[PDB]
XYZ file of C-alpha atoms in Angstrom:
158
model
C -41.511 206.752 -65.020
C -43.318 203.806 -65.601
C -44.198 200.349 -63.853
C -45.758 197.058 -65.318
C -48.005 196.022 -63.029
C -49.698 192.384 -63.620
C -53.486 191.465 -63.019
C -54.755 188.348 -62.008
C -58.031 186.964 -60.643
C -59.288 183.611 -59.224
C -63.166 184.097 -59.998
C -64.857 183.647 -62.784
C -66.783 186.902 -63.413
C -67.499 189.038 -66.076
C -64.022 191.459 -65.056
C -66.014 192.306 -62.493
C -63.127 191.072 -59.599
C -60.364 192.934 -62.422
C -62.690 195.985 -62.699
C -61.696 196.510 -58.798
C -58.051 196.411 -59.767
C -58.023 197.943 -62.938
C -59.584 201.558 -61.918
C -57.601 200.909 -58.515
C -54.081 200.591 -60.598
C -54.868 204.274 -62.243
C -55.573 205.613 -58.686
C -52.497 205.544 -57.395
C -50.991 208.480 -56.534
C -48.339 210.153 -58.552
C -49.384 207.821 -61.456
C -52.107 207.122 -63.783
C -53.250 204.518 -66.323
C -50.943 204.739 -68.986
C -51.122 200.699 -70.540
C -53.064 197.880 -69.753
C -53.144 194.555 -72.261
C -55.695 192.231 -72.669
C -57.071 189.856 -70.192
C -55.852 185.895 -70.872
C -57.247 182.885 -69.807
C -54.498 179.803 -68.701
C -56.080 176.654 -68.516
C -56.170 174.839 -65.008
C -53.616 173.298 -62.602
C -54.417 169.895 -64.178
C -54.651 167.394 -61.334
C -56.908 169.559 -58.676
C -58.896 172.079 -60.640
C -58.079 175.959 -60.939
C -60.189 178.544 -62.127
C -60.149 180.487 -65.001
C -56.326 182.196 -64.277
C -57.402 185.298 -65.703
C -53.817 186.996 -66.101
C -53.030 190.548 -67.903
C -50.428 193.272 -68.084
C -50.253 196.707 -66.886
C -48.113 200.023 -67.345
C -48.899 202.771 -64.896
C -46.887 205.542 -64.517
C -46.208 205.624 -60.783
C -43.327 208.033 -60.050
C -43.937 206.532 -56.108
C -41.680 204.556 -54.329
C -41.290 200.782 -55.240
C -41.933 200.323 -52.221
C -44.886 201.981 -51.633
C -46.050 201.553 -55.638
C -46.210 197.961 -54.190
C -47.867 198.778 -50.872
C -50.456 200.613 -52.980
C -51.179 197.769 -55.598
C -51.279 195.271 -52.738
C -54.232 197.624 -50.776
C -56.231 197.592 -53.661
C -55.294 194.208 -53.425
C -56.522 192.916 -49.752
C -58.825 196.734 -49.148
C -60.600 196.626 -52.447
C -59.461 193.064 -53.873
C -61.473 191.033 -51.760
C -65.077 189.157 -52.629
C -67.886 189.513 -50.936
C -70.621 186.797 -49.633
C -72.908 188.046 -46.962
C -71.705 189.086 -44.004
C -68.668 187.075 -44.401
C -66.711 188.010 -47.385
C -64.325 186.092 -49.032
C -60.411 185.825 -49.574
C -58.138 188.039 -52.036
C -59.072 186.978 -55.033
C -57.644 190.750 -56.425
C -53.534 190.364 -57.382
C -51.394 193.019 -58.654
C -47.576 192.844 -58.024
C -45.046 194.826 -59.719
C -43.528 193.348 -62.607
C -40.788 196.145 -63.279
C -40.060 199.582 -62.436
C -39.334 201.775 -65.380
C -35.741 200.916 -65.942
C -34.597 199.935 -62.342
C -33.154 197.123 -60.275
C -34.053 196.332 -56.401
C -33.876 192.783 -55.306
C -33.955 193.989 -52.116
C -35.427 191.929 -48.918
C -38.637 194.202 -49.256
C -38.460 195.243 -52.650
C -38.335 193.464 -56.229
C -38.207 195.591 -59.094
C -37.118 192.183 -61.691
C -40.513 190.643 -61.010
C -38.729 187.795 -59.501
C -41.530 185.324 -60.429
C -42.370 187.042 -64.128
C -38.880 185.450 -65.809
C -40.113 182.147 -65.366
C -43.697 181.882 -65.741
C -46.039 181.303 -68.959
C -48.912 183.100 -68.121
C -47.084 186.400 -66.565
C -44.867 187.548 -69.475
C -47.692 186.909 -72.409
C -49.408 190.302 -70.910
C -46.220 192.119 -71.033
C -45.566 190.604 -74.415
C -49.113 192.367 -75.754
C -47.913 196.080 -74.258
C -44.194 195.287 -74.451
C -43.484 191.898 -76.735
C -39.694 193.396 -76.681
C -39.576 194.618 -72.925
C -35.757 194.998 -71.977
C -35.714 194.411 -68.678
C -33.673 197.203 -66.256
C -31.158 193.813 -65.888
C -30.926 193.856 -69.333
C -33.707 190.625 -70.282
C -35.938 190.705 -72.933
C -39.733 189.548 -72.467
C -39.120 188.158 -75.779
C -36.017 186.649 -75.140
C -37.524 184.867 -72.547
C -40.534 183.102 -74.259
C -38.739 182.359 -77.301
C -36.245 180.563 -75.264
C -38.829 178.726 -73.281
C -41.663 178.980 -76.077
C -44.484 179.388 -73.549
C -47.835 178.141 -74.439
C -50.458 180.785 -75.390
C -53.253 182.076 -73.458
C -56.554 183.069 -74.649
C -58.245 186.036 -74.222
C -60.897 186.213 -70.716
């Protein structure tokens, strides 16, 4: 099998916050790094002020349960996805949330195989579109499909 796993950081290090994620995404059990795009770079919020929203694409090969695949990613997430300042570290700046499943479909109050929040975003579906620009979604979608009919804006690379 095969899950597309999504990367993205709120700091503005040298991958050093991604790093974290990135060997943590290949030590998953029953999986191991099989794809990973490039790193983008989305401009700001606008208004406020957001950092550099450092946002990439993943395909490990979990054979886990979507469930637990997501459970895993999200420990890496909050165990090994956190910064540290003295002896009060910070938030979780570490994201990784499970885009797809191989060819599957959950929707399910726990589980989300059809990244519900990757069909309608410009800075979640570029990554996929570097590892798969013509991703056929288990619903049947196509990454492509998708930002040619909304013609999302570009990111740069981190």
């Amino acid at each position: 099998t095969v899950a597309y796993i999504a990367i993205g950081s709120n700091l503005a290090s040298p991958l050093e916050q991604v790093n974290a994620a990135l060997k943590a995404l290949g030590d998953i059990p029953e999986s191991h790094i099989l794809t990973v795009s490039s790193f983008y770079r989305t401009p700001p919020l606008g208004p406020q002020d957001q950092p550099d929203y450092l946002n990439a694409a993943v395909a490990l090969e979990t054979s886990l349960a979507p469930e637990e695949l997501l459970n895993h990613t999200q420990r890496i997430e909050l165990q090994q996805g956190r910064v540290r300042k003295a002896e009060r570290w910070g938030p979780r700046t570490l994201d990784l949330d499970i885009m797809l499943f191989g060819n599957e479909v959950i929707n399910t109050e726990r589980l989300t195989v059809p990244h519900y929040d990757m069909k309608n975003r410009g800075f979640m579906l570029w990554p996929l579109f570097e590892i798969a620009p013509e991703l056929v979604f288990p619903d049947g979608e196509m990454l492509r499909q998708i930002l040619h009919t909304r013609a999302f804006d570009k990111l740069n690379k981190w």
